[PDB]
Amino acid sequence: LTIGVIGKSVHPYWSQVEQGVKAAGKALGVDTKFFVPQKEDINAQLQMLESFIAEGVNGIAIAPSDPTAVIPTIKKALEMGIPVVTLDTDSPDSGRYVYIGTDNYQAGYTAGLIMKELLGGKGKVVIGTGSLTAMNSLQRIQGFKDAIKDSEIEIVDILNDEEDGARAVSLAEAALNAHPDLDAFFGVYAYNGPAQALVVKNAGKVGKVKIVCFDTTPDILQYVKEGVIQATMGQRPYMMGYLSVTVLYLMNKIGVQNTLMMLPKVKVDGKVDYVIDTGVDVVTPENLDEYLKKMEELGIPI
Amino acid sequence: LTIGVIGKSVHPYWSQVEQGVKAAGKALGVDTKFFVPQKEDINAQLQMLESFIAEGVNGIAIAPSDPTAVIPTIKKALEMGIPVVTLDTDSPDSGRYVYIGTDNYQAGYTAGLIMKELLGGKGKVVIGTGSLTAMNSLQRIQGFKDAIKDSEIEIVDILNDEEDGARAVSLAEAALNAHPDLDAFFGVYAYNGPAQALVVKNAGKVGKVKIVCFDTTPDILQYVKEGVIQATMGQRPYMMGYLSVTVLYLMNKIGVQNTLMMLPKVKVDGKVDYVIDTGVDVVTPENLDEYLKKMEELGIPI
Ligand SMILES: OC[C@H]1O[C@@H](O)[C@H](O)[C@@H](O)[C@@H]1O
């Protein structure tokens, strides 16, 4: 059997997902194809998707940079008898059987409450994300807004870098100059937190300008350690990759229905959906050490 | 790989469980050992459990007729690296990783609410079960009690047949001739429903005496067709046996933890537990054709 997985960018975050993909494949005796474009690239994801289908893979897990754009192709994959699940970010109307990843809206809400606390309920915030089409970005941002709604905290900007590191840095660097009265940064994607951290450090504003972001890749954790980042919403990319392969494997061996019978279910608009929530680890400078301990203890060290 | 499954009795209900166990094994390439004593026999379950452990199976799924009696042995199995899950009825402190089956307490509550409606909150009811140790029987019973608590309905008898057909019958008709003024019969196990129905149809009480039971085996359904049984809480024995083999298979291939995070979790006494609720189908004479249609569509016809 062969299973194909499609990510959204070349960030180390997707490396963790790939490791999960390969480990699951090795444990189950399955071949895995992994693809991630350099930066956000909807057309490349579509072509790779078209390609995996033509190759006749037995399963596809995809993290859509655009949930609507992939619907027709995902429908074809399903017509061709190839199971499809989403991971990292969802496309609920595509026909994908299961979404596997973080509860994005809530992850953002939590980050919003943390921010609300750090700023004492007031101040100006600039948001940095790598997409304005991916549903996971929109949900994290939406949840952030909903969490600070009952305060005087105002978001003065939402900057999209298309999942490009240099671009994320220069956009945050300019936003800092356009807003010398900025109180905080909110990084929605893995590139954003450490980009805003470099900006703030470069301007000598560590502590002055708060940073609440996502993920726990090396560069981020190092800034959390230096105290530049007060809090980051850590995900479980590895698990997302490992369970995606597993779920698709089962759907081939035991069938789509039997596989769904054993997964967590939720209700959307009075209808049943399937969601495996991989959880978030709220990491701050105070609990960093426990985090490095907890991770290695769970089997995914450093 | 070899998976061992232990049932509670020779009822056709367990044949359904076994078909699932054999279907899963076949689809996954796993050998399956299946055991059920003639009637309730805790000692036989324990003896069979000890042999599967000695024979070094790679997984065990058990439906303990006594949740406490099996703890030391299940613990021994786990100590020796053999994953254990429960199905049909639980043993929450045995150390088993997952419970796969009906939500027994709630299915009982639902059963109680249906009676309460049928009897106008008043009348004499006699419960018929096949165990007073098995947790699924105690939960279904405690649930029936909790549902009709604030009504005038009363339970005059709780007859235990130790999962024996003839005993289910002779115990019933020895309650209808000690209570010819009996309002209703409540069958907890699959043996009970048909027995109670055979009795009631004999004493020409078809309709007079109310019958609310569990399961949808040939006989139970037949009597729902003749309006002898008004409502029966149907389970999914097939799914229980199929998923039990699947879960144990995964635990061997990808590990216990990776498998657990794929399943629905619940919080019990502040600690996370894993439970696959195979759901219940409330069947009445009104929808006895829709139920047949539904089962036919899910791949488990007739
Ligand atoms: O920017 C890299 C990655 O960051 C993560 O936080 C997001 O969940 C991914 O969708 C994104 O591709």
Ligand SMILES: OC[C@H]1O[C@@H](O)[C@H](O)[C@@H](O)[C@@H]1O
């Ligand atoms: O008595 C036959 C069977 O009836 C079912 O209702 C119960 O779930 C089983 O535990 C029992 O073995």
